[PDB]
Symmetry: D2
Subunit: 450 residues, 4 copies
């Protein structure tokens, strides 16, 4: 079953049960690039509700719309923001580069729902263009995915990491520069580096919220105020702030805000920096936890996967593999974002959909993996104290402890001999004319090296 | 409704209507990264059928499996390749970096269907690992998406472009180097550059099929032949060739084939080169067709979108915008592919899922946009002969025609004067002591400049 | 002539006239990657002086060094910072990933100069490692290239752009979205978008100075305080602040500061955002200024290059071409910086030299092109008022001016007719039953559209 | 001292001792971007000689030039190709995007040398433009850097790797998937993966020579034959083949050859694939060789650097660090190459200099590091047989050897017990009711696992 409808290019069969109109139906059959996987990112659909709902309130204020119509659009708009009318946004990312098609998608459905509870162009899109409106929906959603989704789960990741940092603070281990044996440090200090990276990462993405706080709405087709009442920007950007719970200003220069999306390239660059930080932590942990007999085996990773009896003690760091796979995706997504970010042309940058998609995709992926990694990995890591101690005493790096109370020549003879024999520093000092067992400890205490 | 099942980690509720087992159900709830949008690329699911079906035939040959079991797995396997059991592969891309989870997904469902028509590990995964098997499914699918989807639609794109090249072969236009006015060329020659780029692009991706022709299957867990009958590689890689319609060899060095996916980085690099070629063509056309009054307006683009009566003759090059958005995505996807491509570790590269996904995503997107662009744009472009001629005679570049039959001094005086007055070369030559109207044409014929 | 010298690996011939020692000479012949073009970035050489000079003062304070030796190292160190001993740093970028070789290069020469006015390891490298020391020289130089070189020239670029913005503020022009004809805006408003982008760019790079303000010095070999007197970090990072004129703190977590260089990836990401902004401005200007007869020709670009008499009025936007070439290089350099930025391993990231080089190379290039572009292009741009006006009246976009004082039907008939005839809105309104000449102006004033 | 000279823009002081003219001097002071480090890549300067020398021969053939003039230009041109007049090419990369300035640089000096032994434009640049000529110099140099520099040193790298592969062919070691313990393989097989990667890399770059074989020369300003004698392309591209020793054809479509440099993006993509291959090999070796007591220490790396007596047996894999730093640079350089590669505009791509520079820079760097790494690392690597054997017997993976001659239950009890006790499989089997010492060997022979 269908339902004939009109636009301008004439008659067209629109599905009976869907809330969209002709324009959405015609564009849906013109840009089927990528299939359902590329279906316009949901958190962007929800932002249209917030914007259209807000568009109603602020235009009704300026007396441009009849209150009855408003109360109708508002409810319908907030039901989008709610997530009930998600199946009515079938449009893909690779559509018009200005996001015109999805904006018209929002209007058509928020219009047909308003009726049910009238005009797609004159009412819902009143005092707005497809140009100022889209880059406003980008900033809102992005801000919401970060403040509400990312940041929260990013903090948990830091706390869970800091707990273990506290938990392994007494365990002294060997440092590895150039992958080689180095002087000691606590395993807790090792993990406090991971914690600091995560912390910095939070401030980096939290800071990005600032460039996103500036909204284009009010600049219409070219950044010029035309077809808008004076102060609409300030009112709408104020109305949206009250609707989201976040503070949003209007863009100081409406041209810069439409002609380019530098605020996305920045933010992406911050997420990109975070991805580097998480790659290092995830690779370390999997190396540190590798084994059981032919690897570091310093840490013991949880076995969230079912193991074969024939291979006991074998656990693949699958939460590390999934995390590192995510991280790379972001590096690639950011790459895609910067080229598109330089491709603006005159008054408008027609690479919006592809930019905000990769940005939204990066945020979703990060949050999911950050969560998955915390719960399924870090929240259960435990130290292999016997292995760690085994490897401390076998190393020749703790030879500098003797140096002041022995002399460089004797201490090197100890190291030189122990290396050639494949014996420990204690054993070497003893077989040689150096010191005693109940004295070696008097001077070579691991925890006496900061 | 559910259905309790077993694996090793115990009991687990598996949906009643789905064909998968415990392992798939446990992993599905451990790696929900990205949601349904990241759901493992379908053409990869289909390749598992081809491989498992082939795994049956070749293992039955080596006498390792009971014929009854085989006939069962075969039908079930080919029903995956068919696309009937697609809703039973709910796994995402960011799972185990070896693709183990999706391979086990294929086995569990091809096993439960086999019954219905028995063992997930001993029968379906017989003589194969999750390590040699996955990079084999990557090459098969990729090869199939290119030979059957891409290349075909890429040729049409070239033919449609070459038709117009032939069609506008008589139309002489101005060349634009440094975006400035230059000597003439036919609009057909302009379009024959687009055609050549497309042609080169085809040979570039067609050539990539070669590195993909080499299959890992037979190398098991580390590239070593262990747990495989001798010649299984040659038989299976032969059996798969007969099953796909394409020629596939087995990889000469099974280690290089598991430890790294350089064949994906190459192919991606070829798709990446193609994307550059299509960006240039798409941008040209939109500039060439811009207007109506304040742009080049050399070409007239189809109006596939409904236009407002108040703005006649206005047509946004929406098939150009969608195409360029696609192209950038590929540049980004390739970026993501090269880092992952260098991150192999020892005997295995655990960045497989993310690599083949971006590769499959690039191919789908390209084909879709290549099609969409042909039909909705190039297949209807028409020249604005009056505009083109208007701009030919206004230019001062056709001044070199007079040079031999006049002299450098006179010809520059013509150009110098016409520029200062904002008059044409004809008008200038006449008001000055140079030549006649019925003689100017005798020497300045546009089509006398190769 | 040479000069035999010693280290440990024995005898080696060191050039007679050079100030370096054995280690520098041995490494110079082991890593000749890239030739003189890759010779370690000078501003990095100068920073070593600042650091070594400061290393002297602060270690003399802690009583670790004899005042005579100090006064000697100080003068020699400041002569490096001065730029007199530049020809004594022959080391390339692709050397040890920790920057050990260049640090030892600084020590050897600052030692042999100190003599002349003693120990390379015990005196100049006193209380410091090649690990904490290098990432400190990176931050200092980078901070100095930005505060002293970049930012300054970036502001001039903004002022020169804002002057012209003021200068063309009265000139009304047509807007170009989707490259198509749109509603009007002043050319000054167009240029105020360029100005805003530049302004944002400054705050973006100026902000990056913050992450760079944190110095590693004091963390030695692993981020652990070992082999350093307590408070050396705070004193040295304080002494360096007084030496540079810039405020520098010490890194809160010394591990994060050696294991990763996220502060470079961030800053680079900011320079990367700036490059996008400058690409758009530079491309616009060259398109806007293209012609003379077959292009926009809205602006008139300076002719800094010698033109052929036969081709008058032809000027290639060579300062635009050089600028856009620079911008891309930065996009590539940033790419190189992010991979290296994720490749840290345990306690140390051995991809330092390559990271800070690309960062320094980006800053130099930007400043040079920003300067070159200002002086040789923007500082002389002038508007082609007659062309601009010619194109305003030819467009059909100023049809919405009549709308309120005429009606949508009449106004579209004007537009519909004028389009078909290739006539202006004025001419169309007149030949049709619409309005008068001395009334058309009463309602269609360009500067009545915000 | 100087020497006044003329061009068109008037008088200018040209250094007395330099061979260039006005145009070079004026451009040298207009584009000083990056300083001497960005000085136009030498192998590009040499190619101009080959081209100009060839331009002489072929134009003299077509009777366009006086033999006396030719014999003069030829000698002067070949002295550039020789490398004697290198100090007369002071131009940087960021100049005119068409390479016009360096082409005019070649002409001015090859003209002033010709005299000494006449016209910069009419003689040396006869029958050629700055447009067809530059992308011809790019292909020639690139082809020469690969055939003569890269490929050769790349083969040595493969042979040196294959020698060691043969040398360690008897040594059985443990495999490491997911960084975990796996089934055995010879260290020679491990190194045969490195060898195969290198081999594939050679064919990949060798293949790229093909797209580069097509030369633009003959297409002049727009790809149109104008201002060229018929067959000049075929003659010149033939004359150049005889001059270089390599086979070069002329480009089939001269437009595609000027409007875009896809052949550089391809080749770069091949070098990019090679860089991934070399990163993996270099990282493995440094991990495999890490230690002495707290790392793998499977291999023993040469100590090309002077070591401190206090730290015996410590050797930093500095040839690995330099190699990996190089590899990343290439990944970045390729990135820079692809954006520039999509930025072609109409008839000409004005991003030539920056594209061929990064390409030449990548080739130089690769060759240098490939050499440095071979000689200073691989050509001296030796196995630590006692460590390898130590780690073989400690692993529980060789438990599948017993399986057929014992049963899954017994074999797992052995593995289960040995794991819990931290004892070897031999010891476990003995203390348990399983088998004997002089029988354990009868079944568990390492070299019985392919």
């Amino acid at each position: 079953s269908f339902r004939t409808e009109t636009d301008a290019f004439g008659e067209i069969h629109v599905p009976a049960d869907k809330y969209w109109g002709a324009q959405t139906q015609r564009s849906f059959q013109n840009f089927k690039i990528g299939g359902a996987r590329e279906r316009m990112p949901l958190p962007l659909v929800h932002a249209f509700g917030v914007l259209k709902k807000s568009a109603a309130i602020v235009n009704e204020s300026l007396g441009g719309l009849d209150p009855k119509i408003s109360k109708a659009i508002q409810q319908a708009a907030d039901e989008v923001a709610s997530g009930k009318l998600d199946d009515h946004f079938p449009l893909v990312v690779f559509q018009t580069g200005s996001g015109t098609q999805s904006n018209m998608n929002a209007n058509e459905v928020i219009s047909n729902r308003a009726i049910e509870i009238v005009h797609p162009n004159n009412h819902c899109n009143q005092s707005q263009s497809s140009n100022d409106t889209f880059p406003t929906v980008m900033h809102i959603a992005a801000s919401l995915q970060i403040q509400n989704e990312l940041i929260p789960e990013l903090t948990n990741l830091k706390n869970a990491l800091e707990a273990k940092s506290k938990e392994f603070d007494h365990i002294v281990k060997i440092g590895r520069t150039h992958l080689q044996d180095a002087t000691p440090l606590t395993l807790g200090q090792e993990f406090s580096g991971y914690v600091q990276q995560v912390e910095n990462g939070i401030q980096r993405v939290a800071h990005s919220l600032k460039t996103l706080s500036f909204l284009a709405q009010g600049g219409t087709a070219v950044g010029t105020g035309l077809n808008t009442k004076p102060g609409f920007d300030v009112k709408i950007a104020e109305q949206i702030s009250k609707e989201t719970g976040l503070k949003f200003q209007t863009a100081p220069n409406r041209f810069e805000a439409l002609a380019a999306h530098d605020a996305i390239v920045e933010c992406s660059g911050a997420l990109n920096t975070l991805a580097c930080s998480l790659f290092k932590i995830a690779q370390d942990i999997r190396y540190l936890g590798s084994g059981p007999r032919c690897g570091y085996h310093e840490l013991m990773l949880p076995e969230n996967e079912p193991g074969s009896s024939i291979m006991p003690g074998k656990v693949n760091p699958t939460q590390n593999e999934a995390l590192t796979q995510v991280c790379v995706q972001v590096m690639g997504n950011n790459a895609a974002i910067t080229f598109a970010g330089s491709q603006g042309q005159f008054e408008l940058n027609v690479f919006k959909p592809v930019m905000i998609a990769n940005l939204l995709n990066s945020i979703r992926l990060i949050t999911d993996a950050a969560y998955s990694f915390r719960v399924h990995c870090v929240e259960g890591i435990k130290a292999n104290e016997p292995r760690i101690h085994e490897l401390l005493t076998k190393s020749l790096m703790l030879v500098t402890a003797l140096n002041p109370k022995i002399g460089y020549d004797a201490a090197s003879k100890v190291a030189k001999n122990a290396h050639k024999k494949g014996i420990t520093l204690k054993e070497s000092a003893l077989e040689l004319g150096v010191l005693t067992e109940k004295e070696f400890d008097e001077w070579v205490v691991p925890e006496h090296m900061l």
